[PDB]
Symmetry: C3
Subunit: 625 residues, 3 copies
């Protein structure tokens, strides 16, 4: 013979933590139901020995855990699902429960030397026949749970909603104890009649109580009992074969809960071992019994990414940076040529032999200057810098996608933001110094034959491709409209011959006109622009030559100020940013991937179920002795 | 040629301090009534020298005090303390925030200020009616304010003075806005044929921090020589704020000294009565609240010391065993009296195993049922209540029987002291109890002793049962309910319930009777006749108690009786001056005591003052 | 050559500080307009590179100044039109713009090494034209119009392009910008840009400022992301966008280029406007204030000195007996009223002409008649009278000195001075008041009066009647000015037993006093000559006795109140003036309208000179 309800309540509360399980339901609890004003709060406060229950309607279920604490002469409260502990003032507790109703069971624990080791549930706002109410009656009123029906006595037992719902939840009254309140408001003759009832008979009988009337609130319950005890000692003979007073209920609940919880110990062990055996298989199959620490997972996957960036570092600083850059400046040259040269009516004049010393010989010399300045004073500093920045940021996205981090968005953003944070710190340093080192190209260059030659081959290839893009777009209209139907629209808009159709036709004219321009220029580049300082009024070659000088000088200052510094500092910064993440964030970050969430959640269950079972089995082995 | 107004005002002030007296009302005060939005505020603010009325950003009991070397102008609110308001902006707020028959007692102190007492009744006059009688009818001087722009022949503020004083002495007239009206019509206003007053009439004008003291000097300079520039247009007249003030000063001097003779009379009349009441009801015995509280607490402290002696011993042992007696009965009902085989326990010799086993098992469950019941907790709480109960008895026997606030402080500090030791006592008791949780020992000395107890315990139980049983016979019928009893045995309102109770009481009395016979003759030998539950349970109850009562005195009692006086004393010192008066005034006779002696002291102070002034004023 | 937009926008901001000019008007700014939900706030935020516009109702326009601050990677915002500078948190910028909408333009400036040098005016949403009193004003003068139009909407139905023709027929100062190019076919997009209904010289720009998918706004990420997608679409659809201007990059490039051309061309006419505006303001300054500068603080102090001068010049002269006379005026009026309050209403006043009395009771009745009269003037309460008289004398005279100075138009200063003066005088109130009643102790009786004092006494008492009963009778002449019937001796009788019945009672009182003073006049002149022997004329015994107290009264008025005032008043004033803040002094000075004009005119000249030095210099360089 030994009382282990303290331990059994720990098991129930442990099992209450396993996500969606009928395991905790197998361990009974004393559920309290009673009409509003039937004295239900009064009988509860009597068990606790203090006031804390506020008396609006539908206060919402209160999962009350009474825990006996040695060396604690005072009464304390704890709302764990809010990390609130050792509340010595019960007025605060009373208003906390009021603040909460402004179905979710309030997790509140009471700890004191006076209090017995119990588990109770305060079911509030009743039903007098006339959905959410249906849910609580299934969740709390069923299972092995003991029902405490609070009857007021100054009410007929057929009229009480408490006993009516009790028979509905039962009947036969095997797991129902009926408490009869306001025993003082009825003659001891009828009081004994109500208790020894025969309409609503219960296995765990009836208890008759009187509960009316620390120092201000402790003495309150002492005064209340003095009166209750008085009435019962005086009317002793009137209450033959009767269970009466607060003391006898505390006594009853203690006896019944021990019987109830321990009888449910073998059923719960079977059910736990059952869920524990299913959950072990799932672990060994989906995740091959591998333990997963979230902060570890997080850090190890960052090491992989940090490795990926070292691999990118290896194959980038090179002519690859020249390529990304020159490709952008190639497009600027093409724009400089269209906005200046290509639209000019006398563009054919450059292909001619004769020249007029003053007016026309200087016209092209001036044109070539503001075309060159247009490109050199364009903004190479910001361009180069903001170009190579996107390049890194983009390759980072590729590295992130080629790793397990492809499933974690919150991590991916951390990496991306911290990457741009690193890059930004050197934006000005890079951009400004790049502009300063590209100034010698802003006003003519003393280029060698070698420089001029390389530029010429590139310019030919540039215009080759530019012309091939225009012809294809011209042929695109030629086929989509009709070879002949095209000439109809073109000649009409031109007015040399005769809505949606005219748009295609007008475009086709521009393209027809462009190709002619690019053709007489491409042909010239191949047949004429051979000399350096002499053939200088060959824009395509000169512009490409200055852009070659601009690119090779920019890529060197991009490395020194931006590239090198990023590769060193980014890992160091990334690590710093990770250590800033609290345990909470890290779990959420890792739980993004549903496979990893599934992983985290399954082991949390396994460990909790293992904890419950160990406690149960050690108790069972002892109980079998 | 002395102006003892400062003292006469002082006398009026302290006579207003007495709970219920018409002595202060005898002493005159310049009551002011004026036309609403005319300039009722402006006229008063001029007398003082600063702005304060909430009419610009209920009745104000204004008390002007002349103070030496106080070049600055300060304000007091004796009812709200503060006592020094330099900046008059917060005074303006104070009169507006307080305005959200009650007199606002405001005091103004400065060297510019003359010695005067005034009352500011708002605008024109169940509430309005009382203000008209309370301050105007009495021997208090009246002042009327209006506006020159509105009808001058029709003045409600002057009409109210005519209604309260038709063709009377104590009245002073005031006319404002003299800049808007010509000096001709204003000449007929002062020496009027319509409303003549023996005190006189005066004409003035009030238009347009010390920026507020400059504002009064601007408005005074505004029309200083205006009364000079047209001397004939105002000859045989009382003109300017300077002479108005001089008038209020000299009239009050006489008015207050006129009323000084009947007041000294009425004071003595109301003092001889109060000194008679003190002589008859209290016998001139003085009452200091703090002293009364401490002296009565000392009496209570002694009552606890006297009880400490008459407690513990067997007196504590008796209460504990009586509660254990009830548990033995409850254990016996739950494990014996509701069992058919109860006779088998005596009648014949038990079987070789099964029958001996069952009855030996039953006393083990019953013993554990008693020992593992929760004695520690039970014991502690029994004695805890015992102290609180006796504490109330000591309280009701004393002078504190009328003082609930104290009774609660006492009952609270006691439970706090007892609570301090609850765990240590209960736990200690549960330890000394454990060696009795599974032990079949003792001797015939305590067995024969517990046997005799078991007889008497079953006896009084049978008595109470028979009584209740035979009492239902009277309520229904000896042969009437007897037939109704048999009606429930074959089928196996009030009468069906009373019958079902009687069926139980019948067999129970027969159950206790056969058990009583057993205990008498059969139960005798110690450990041999062990299966005599009522005896074994009485033996264990006598041990449980004896051991418990020892640690109840060790842990709980000794510490209570030592520490409780110390903490009670500590808690009383934590009471404020306001608390002490409230705690003591709870008894109506004690409230009467203080109320009377407060009036007595104040009336003696007024008289000693008023008398000495009369000795001077006659010479 | 160089791009002096940064310097040109600095000039435009100065020209926005001159309270009455069309100077800033002649310098270009990019006025942005577009229908609600067309990407107007989205295009501005792409240039800025940070989210800053609130998304509340969009009330008053935003004067958006963009400063390219070197070494500042971090994008910071400042609200110059309030004391709020380098704001790092753009949430607070968003909510400040929102708070400022709870019709002047909102002065907001963005600083960064990323942000270009640009002037922009964010005009309210919808731009329907219908009301648009802001649009008419801002879309005119030399200003570039940026017409934000969404591609998903027909160009003919665009609110921005409509107003652009309504303000600029022929697109000579309008840049068309077509947003939402991602909600339109690239062939149709090229169609919108290569328009013919609304063709513009400045061009059309196709943009995509779509956010594709929380420190994302702290850095330039959200923005980088939005551009990366935009750059993708125009690289993929490069083939379709032939002879088109596409991307935010090209728009930012265009805005920078165009603004330079615009601002530099508009520079030359603006200098001509500033030069005239300065010449006009310099002229007024020469002709109104002979080109003399004004320092509000210096001005006030200098005028205070002139005021402090008057008090010193008033101190030396006004002491002697000039105050003693003002005290004699308000003390002889009490010798006048000692009789009226007592001695006058006596019927036995006549029998003293006979000079026959009884040694037992007749010689006792007239002795205590003068003991009550001698105490009715010595216990009168002159302390408060003399002190507050002199206090008010000093106070009135101070206002005179203030009108005598330029301080006549500044009331706040006039208050400050008078407040200080009364405070200084207050600190000596009781001290003086008590000293006037302390020195009057043996003078409360009559032993102090001699034969020599009686000389001026008998004569100044007949001279008392002289001036007073002539000026008081001059006002008795003021009644016969208005009118006439009267009748006229009969009114007095039927009263003795409407309007004129009131003067009948006035006349009956005057008749009594006119005879009562006269039989005294004919007697006291040739009756009482002796000092100790003759003691029955109160008029001669009190008119000089009050003035014998008056002589002893001005002495202690000087000792306590007067000496201290003249000493401590400049000291306390100088102290009280230091307390005044630079904001308070400007407000105190700006009380006079001529001074408030002076301050404004020289401030305008200063700003105008500042701006011109900058314009003229830029022009010299540009003309080379
Ligand atoms: N007379 C009497 N009143 C009681 C008793 N028990 C509870 N009450 C009163 O019943 C009233 C309302 O019930 P309450 O205690 O709030 O419990 P509820 O049923 O949760 O509302 C309170 O005012 C209690 O004092 C009792 O046993 N006797
Ligand atoms: N011109 C002039 N206005 C006065 C005079 N007396 C009072 N007032 C005006 O009366 C108005 C309101 O009266 P107030 O002084 O607030 O006293 P209230 O009657 O308590 O409201 C103010 O605007 C005053 O300026 C006066 O003698 N001359
Ligand atoms: N698809 C697409 N949406 C855009 C584009 N530009 C802006 N938006 C969206 O257009 C909506 C309203 O535009 P907003 O910038 O507020 O224009 P405003 O109302 O004229 O200031 C916003 O929800 C933007 O996300 C774009 O270029 N493409």
């Amino acid at each position: 013979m030994l009382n282990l309800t303290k331990q059994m309540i720990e098991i129930r509360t442990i099992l209450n933590k396993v996500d969606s399980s009928s395991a905790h339901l197998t361990l009974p609890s004393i559920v309290v139901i009673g009409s509003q004003s039937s004295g239900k709060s009064s009988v509860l406060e009597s068990i606790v020995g203090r006031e804390f229950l506020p008396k609006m309607v539908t206060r919402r279920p209160i999962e009350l855990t009474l825990v006996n604490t040695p060396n604690s002469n005072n009464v304390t409260a704890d709302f764990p699902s809010m990390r609130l502990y050792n509340i010595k003032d019960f007025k605060e507790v009373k208003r906390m429960l009021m603040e909460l109703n402004m179905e979710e069971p309030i997790q509140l624990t009471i700890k004191s030397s006076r209090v017995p080791d119990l588990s109770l549930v305060d079911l509030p706002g009743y039903i007098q026949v006339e959905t959410k109410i249906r849910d609580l009656c299934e969740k709390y009123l069923t299972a092995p749970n003991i029902i405490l029906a609070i009857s007021a006595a100054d009410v007929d037992l057929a009229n009480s909603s408490a006993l009516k719902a009790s028979k509905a939840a039962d009947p036969k009254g095997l797991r129902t104890i009926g408490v009869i309140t306001k025993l003082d408001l009825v003659d001891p003759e009828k009081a004994r009649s109500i208790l020894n009832n025969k309409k609503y008979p219960l296995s765990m009988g009836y208890v008759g109580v009187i509960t009316k009337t620390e120092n201000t609130n402790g003495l309150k319950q002492i005064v209340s009992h003095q009166f209750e005890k008085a009435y019962f000692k005086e009317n002793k003979k009137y209450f033959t074969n009767c269970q009466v007073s607060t003391k006898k209920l505390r006594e009853k609940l203690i006896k019944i809960l021990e019987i109830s919880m321990s009888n449910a110990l073998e059923p719960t062990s079977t059910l736990i071992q059952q869920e524990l055996d299913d959950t072990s298989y799932l672990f060994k199959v989906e995740f091959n019994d591998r333990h997963l620490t979230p902060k570890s997972y997080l850090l190890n996957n960052i090491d992989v990414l940090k490795l990926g960036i070292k691999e990118f570092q290896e194959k980038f600083h090179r002519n690859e940076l020249k390529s990304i850059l020159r490709a952008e400046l190639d497009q600027k040259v093409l724009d400089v040529l269209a906005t200046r040269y290509w639209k000019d009516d006398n563009l054919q004049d450059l292909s001619s032999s004769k020249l007029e010393s003053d007016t026309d010989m200087l016209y092209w010399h001036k044109k070539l200057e503001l075309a060159s300045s247009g490109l050199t004073k364009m903004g190479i500093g910001r361009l180069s810098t903001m170009l190579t920045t996107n390049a890194i940021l983009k390759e980072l996205d590729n590295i992130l996608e080629s790793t397990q981090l492809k499933n974690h968005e919150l991590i991916k953003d951390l990496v991306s933001n911290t990457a741009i944070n690193v890059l930004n710190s050197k934006y000005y340093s890079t951009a400004d110094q790049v502009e300063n080192c590209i100034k010698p190209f802003k006003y003519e260059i003393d280029l060698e034959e070698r420089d001029w030659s390389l530029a010429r081959q590139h310019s030919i290839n540039l215009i080759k491709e530019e012309l091939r893009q225009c012809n294809s777009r011209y042929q695109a209209i030629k086929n989509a409209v009709g070879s002949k139907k095209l000439a109809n629209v073109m000649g009409y808009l031109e007015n040399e011959s005769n809505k949606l159709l005219l748009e295609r036709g007008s475009e086709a004219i521009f393209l027809d006109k462009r190709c002619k321009v690019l053709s007489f220029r491409l042909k010239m580049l191949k047949n004429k622009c051979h000399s350096t300082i002499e053939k200088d009024r060959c824009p395509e070659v000169f512009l490409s030559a200055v852009s070659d000088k601009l690119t090779s000088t920019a890529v060197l200052f991009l490395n020194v100020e931006l590239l090198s510094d990023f590769f060193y500092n980014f890992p160091i910064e990334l690590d710093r940013r990770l250590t800033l993440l609290g345990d909470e964030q890290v779990e959420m970050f890792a739980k993004e991937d549903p496979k990893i969430s599934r992983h985290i959640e399954l082991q949390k269950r396994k460990e909790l179920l293992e904890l419950a079972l160990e406690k149960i089995d050690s108790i069972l082995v002892f109980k079998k002795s």
